[PDB]
Amino acid sequence: GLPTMLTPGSNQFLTSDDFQSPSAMPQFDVTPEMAIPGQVNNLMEIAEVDSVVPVNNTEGKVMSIEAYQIPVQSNSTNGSQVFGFPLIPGASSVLNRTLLGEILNYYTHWSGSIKLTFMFCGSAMATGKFLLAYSPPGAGAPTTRKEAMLGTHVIWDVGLQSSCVLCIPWISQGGYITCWYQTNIVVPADTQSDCKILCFVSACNDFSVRMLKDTPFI
Amino acid sequence: GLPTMLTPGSNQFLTSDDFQSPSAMPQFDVTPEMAIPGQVNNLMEIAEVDSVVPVNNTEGKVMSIEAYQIPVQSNSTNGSQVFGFPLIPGASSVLNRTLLGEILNYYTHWSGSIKLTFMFCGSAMATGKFLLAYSPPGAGAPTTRKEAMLGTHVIWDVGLQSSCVLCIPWISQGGYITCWYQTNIVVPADTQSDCKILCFVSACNDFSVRMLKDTPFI
Amino acid sequence: GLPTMLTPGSNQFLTSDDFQSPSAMPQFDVTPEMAIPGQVNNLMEIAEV
Amino acid sequence: RVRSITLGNSTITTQECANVVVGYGTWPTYLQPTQPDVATCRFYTLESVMWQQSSPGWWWKFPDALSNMGLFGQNMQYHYLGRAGYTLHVQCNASKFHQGCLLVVCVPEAEMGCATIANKPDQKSLSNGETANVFDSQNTSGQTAVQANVINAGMGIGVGNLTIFPHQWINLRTNNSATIVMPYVNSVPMDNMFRHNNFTLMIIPFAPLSYSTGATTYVPITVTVAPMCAEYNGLRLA
Amino acid sequence: RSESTVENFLCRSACVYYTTYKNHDNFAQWVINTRQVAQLRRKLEMFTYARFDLELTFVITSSQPVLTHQIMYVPPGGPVPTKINSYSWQTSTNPSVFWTEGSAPPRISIPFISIGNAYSMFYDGWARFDKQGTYGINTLNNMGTLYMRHVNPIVSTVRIYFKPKHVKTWVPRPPRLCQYQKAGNVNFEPSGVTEGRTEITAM
Amino acid sequence: RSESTVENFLCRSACVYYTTYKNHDNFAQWVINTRQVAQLRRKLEMFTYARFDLELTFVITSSQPVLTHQIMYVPPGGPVPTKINSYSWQTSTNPSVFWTEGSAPPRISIPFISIGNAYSMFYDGWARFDKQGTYGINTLNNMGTLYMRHVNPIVSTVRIYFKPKHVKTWVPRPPRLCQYQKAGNVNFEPSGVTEGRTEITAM
């Protein structure tokens, strides 16, 4: 026959290799594909879907649907903080179980921008303002409404917009989000309960991941 | 020589593989083919041939040719059932040993339509009607002639047609066939015995099979 | 299969050889190069300083 | 501004500005002879449910939810094999003095867990036909009961991630309705409608209902369903 | 985004089964199942339907002249061994490999083999509506079974390495929150959505 | 209809012979015969005439330095061993393979070798009309014989795997109803056509 030499690496099984192998049943005619709605080609297609963020994940709230409901006290102290959190999708307890957070926990390294949507769920006739502020990585977090106001922010008037959307320029494997009570919430009538805010998160732009790992959630 | 690596799967015998092998007698000149009538290229060519169905396979009839002979009592009660059976080619004792039934017992899964032919073997001068009814899968079986009449059927007047052919739209790895005495059998003379019906079965259309298995008949 | 013969030199490791080998992580997308000042292509570039 | 939609012998009213969600971007289409049936393409309105400040949520399994519904329900029994898509219209009746927010989501193959780990849930606990099942706020306990604690959507997932499935939000502040178009989704082109539920409709509050004093204490939620492109196995000779 | 594709996420080897058998009921078996390993199961369950081919590699070792082992694959519906000398070990429709120690590990490829157009990860239905114990069983997911024996006192150990190939998936689902309880169902202990914090505010 | 072709129906491996021999009349033999296995025999007997090439693979194991085995094929009409040291083991017209333990199993291919234009499954005639005991024997179906020995106290076991290739068949026949009694004939115990039922009507 044809002269050959076996080289190092011969007769060994690399669990990560890619070689052809014989078919156990070569005579079997395999069932044809049919279109099925919802084909997924990439996991980023999932990471880009908004999911509800458990911002109010405090003891006693984590076991309920209430974890997702940020309370708004209509008669709270003016200038007080409504809510806030460390902006870290792969570590913070607020973001690491969201659809985005789950996908990123399969990778050692990742980066991109994220989108945060805040939705007000008070009555139709409720009005008032919130200050949504962003603190760049390493800047710490505002301690007062004025400090937050002097940084980068948006004034969210719920009487005009039921929701407000932020896109963080940088999210990587930190920064902060805070919301302050610029005004109280003004209503036409005396209600039974408070108002809630829901928060949603998704990938904003082309988001990248690099090396696959076991999820830390088993 | 040429550098090579042996991969997993090397030096093992897969009973289902397909590799070239050396000829034990390479110097032997093999006898040429001659045409022989009857070449078979596919088993469906056999499945499509009508064979006689042992419809009257009751105890004491199975060991005789009588298993194939459906009796017709010329003076039976009007509206009574003549015969009937579960329409399952790969399970029913009526159909699973026919040429079609035998071939399909070599496959785990199969589907297609089947053809049933009913032939009346009374005297030339015998006349009368039968109701051949088909009950779709899951519909159960008619209990009366009227019930059968209100479903899908054909009225078979033996005085015009010595045979009648049905093609079942669906046969797969159930439905029923029944035949009712719409009328009695009218004859010109007093005969010694009853009349018989023979039943035949074959594949009707393109019939499909998928995975080969051991026959259950050894 | 295709008839072959193994020749002398088969199944041995020469520390100075040059053969292809399988990648342990073929699915990993390797970080692109960026220009870095000072690329050295030859040691004579140092000997001449 | 207001649109009148008539199917068969039934009419409903929707708003012209209402949005429509088409699940997976796919509209229902038509697909061993098979027979189509358009006689069932009418609106079937389910008994409404009342949304209270403490309601945990509701669900329906679809092939089963319509099993007693006239002709659609009959075709499920006369034919053994079939397929259909659906349009689901969900609407709330609320004033401008009411607040709250619902997630209206349709979940394919929504296999649900049992309250007892060693067992499987019974058929009635999984579906009560046209009658809605109710999610719990607490852990469910029983031997054949569905684990209905809403936090896990009865599936062992976080409820906030149900947005991956075709859905629409109803924020009473901005909208009182949702429309979802659900294409047929399965591993096979046609199936037995009594042995499998293609999808489950879930309505889950994320912001509790509340209102000004003197306002009605509850909000009715109505679910109206219109089958499309229904097909069943033929029942005749070849 | 190359590492995010479905093929790179799922087309990776895993050890799915570990077993021992002796050469003196002395045979091993494994029903091919994608719910045996929590990490494999959790990734596949992010989809509702899937199609893939299966690559199976066998790492076989033994301890106390040339040992030969037989690995048999029984397709869905094929004859099954009950005994070391059952006739089913010789069925021509049950492919097998004969391998001896000292060579590269055995490897075989099993194509997509369901009669449905996809394997289903979830099934909101019953194999039979008359039996409530069949909830969640989709018979279209039968991938066949493996049987292992010595050809002719020693102990053998087998590790089965599984790798999906040419993977296509449909209808994404939320990742499971709860820990798995059993391979035959989706039962769970109700669980909170995340880890807690001490207050809703930053710092 | 791919699985229904003649080649897919018949071109599948089967174990057709199992035997043992020792290294201390101590040799094994097998006359190539397609009537030894009931499942192979029943499929081939659905035809009256056939042509095929034969692929033979040998799985050889042994128990108590390097053992070498000789597998010899004797074509129809060739010299036959009667003894372990018979001269026939060295005939140049009787091809043989020399194999040692630890390598891949031996495999050889034997072409269609009848002088007729097909092998016959059935023969309504006599090899010689003067001898009634020859009914059913078609001498044109001689496929040759295999002989097996050690080259130079141990016991060897041989499994012979048979696979028809490039199979052509003619004149289809009904499948046998009765169980097989002997390999050298078509004798049967009269049997009923099917399983019985309690009545001719449905339900």
Author numbering:
A (entry chain C), B (entry chain C): 1 to 173, 187 to 231
C (entry chain C): 1 to 49
D (entry chain B): 12 to 42, 52 to 258
E (entry chain A), F (entry chain A): 59 to 82, 87 to 126, 137 to 224, 230 to 280
Q: What do the authors of the reporting publication say about this deposited model?
A:
Coxsackievirus B5 (CVB5) is a genotype of the Enterovirus genus, which is frequently detected in clinical and wastewater surveillance. Here, we employed a reverse genetic system for CVB5 and assessed how different amino acid substitutions in capsid proteins affects the virus’ sensitivity to free chlorine and heat. To elucidate the mechanism behind reduced heat sensitivity of the CVB5F.cas.genogroupB mutant, we subjected it to analysis by cryoEM.
The resulting EM density maps were at 3.6, 2.7, and 2.6 Å global resolution for the capsid-corresponding part of particles F, A, and E, respectively, thus allowing building of atomic models of each state. These two residues interact with each other and contribute to the external part of the VP1:VP3 interface, both through direct contact and indirectly by stabilization of the local loop region comprising residues VP1.E272-T282. Consistently, this region in VP1 undergoes partial restructuring in intermediate-altered (A) and empty particle (E) states, with alanine at VP1.279 facing toward the hydrophobic pocket in VP3 assembled by residues VP3.P86, VP3.A141 and VP3.Y189. Although the C-terminus of VP1 is flexible in different enterovirus structures, the resulting conformation in A and E particles of CVB5F.cas.genogroupB is distinct from the previously published reconstruction of CVB5-A and E particles having the original VP1.D276/VP1.T279 pairing, supporting that VP1.D276E and VP1.T279A mutations may affect the assembly and local dynamics of the VP1:VP3 interface. Several other areas in particle A and E states of CVB5F.cas.genogroupB also exhibit different conformations and/or greater flexibility compared with corresponding CVB5 structures from the PDB. Most prominent changes were in the N-terminal region of VP1 (VP1.Q49-S60), VP2 (VP2.L42-Q52), and VP3 (I168–V181).
